[PDB]
Amino acid sequence: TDTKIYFDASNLPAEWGTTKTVYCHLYAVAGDDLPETSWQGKAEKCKKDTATGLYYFDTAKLKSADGTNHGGLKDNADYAVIFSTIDTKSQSHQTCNVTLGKPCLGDTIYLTGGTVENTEDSSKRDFAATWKNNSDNYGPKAAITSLGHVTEGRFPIYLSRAEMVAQAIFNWAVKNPKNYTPETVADICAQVEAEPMDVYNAYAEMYATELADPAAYPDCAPLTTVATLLGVDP
Ligand SMILES: OC[C@H]1O[C@H](O[C@H]2[C@H](O)[C@@H](O)[C@@H](O[C@H]3[C@H](O)[C@@H](O)[C@@H](O)O[C@@H]3CO)O[C@@H]2CO)[C@H](O)[C@@H](O)[C@@H]1O
Numbered sequence: 498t499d500t501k502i503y504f505d506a507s508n509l510p511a512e513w514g515t516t517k518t519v520y521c522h523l524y525a526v527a528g529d530d531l532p533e534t535s536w537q538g539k540a541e542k543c544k545k546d547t548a549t550g551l552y553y554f555d556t557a558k559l560k561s562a563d564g565t566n567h568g569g570l571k572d573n574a575d576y577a578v579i580f581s582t583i584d585t586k587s588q589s590h591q592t593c594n595v596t597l598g599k600p601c602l603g604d605t606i607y608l609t610g611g612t613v614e615n616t617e618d619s620s621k622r623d624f625a626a627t628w629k630n631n632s633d634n635y636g637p638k639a640a641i642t643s644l645g646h647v648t649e650g651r652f653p654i655y656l657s658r659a660e661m662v663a664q665a666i667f668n669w670a671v672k673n674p675k676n677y678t679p680e681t682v683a684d685i686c687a688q689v690e691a692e693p694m695d696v697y698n699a700y701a702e703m704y705a706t707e708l709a710d711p712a713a714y715p716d717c718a719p720l721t722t723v724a725t726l727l728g729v730d731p
């Protein structure tokens with residue numbers, strides 16, 4: 498019945514300093530059109546439970562694009578969540594990505610110890626975190642990073658391995674070509690168990706609209722680049 502998820506901000510590492518504000522970055526990976534919230538913006542702000550000291554975020558208050566209530570998490574969808582803070586020195590801290598499903602509603606994310614490569618920023622490591630009661634089926638989300646590394650954790654159910662690699666190439670091949678080399682893309686395929694030609698076909702279908710208008714979408718690698726990175730001849 499509880500549509501809230503909770504964050505244990507007690508006994509944080511010294512690096513986190515004194516928590517001032519807590520934020521929840523909850524997003525769909527596959528099977529939902531959930532709008533993404535601005536990182537550490539108003540829509541992400543978590544309330545403090547003054548009784549328990551836990552912070553919480555109500556998934557029942559997630560908004561759709563038309564500003565109405567989204568009607569909660571969907572059953573046949575992959576979600577991921579990050580809890581973050583701004584400390585009394587205005588410095589940001591965050592958990593890694595943790596997989597999220599309906600069984601996790603009413604449960605608490607806590608820091609496990611250890612850090613992991615930030616997905617966006619090679620200068621940063623996030624803090625390993627998982628669910629208190631749902632770690633059997635949910636936990637750290639395996640992510641393809643800005644460097645083309647595949648982080649520790651679980652893979653999605655409703656996003657194919659080929660689609661995951663296609664999305665990484667779409668995200669990073671133009672932005673970070675010194676990392677997104679043919680060697681790196683071969684390594685990604687090996688780590689996520691995707692067939693390169695499946696990645697090429699997935700990319701071509703997924704990003705057809707952007708591929709048709711390079712002038713408008715310059716961060717979308719053209720098919721010729723994607724074929725070269727995957728070592729395939731289409
Ligand atoms: O929205 C989906 C997206 O969410 C997560 O990305 C967030 C990062 O985890 C978070 O750190 C932040 O990234 C910023 C860096 O902290 C900052 O140093 C600098 O590099 O800018 C980054 C933003 O470009 O915000 C993003 C969300 O925008 C998740 O990790 C991703 O895998 C996921 O795709």
Ligand SMILES: [Cl-]
Nearest residue numbers: 613647648649
């Ligand atoms: Cl890792």
Ligand SMILES: [Zn+2]
Nearest residue numbers: 614642644646
């Ligand atoms: Zn790495």
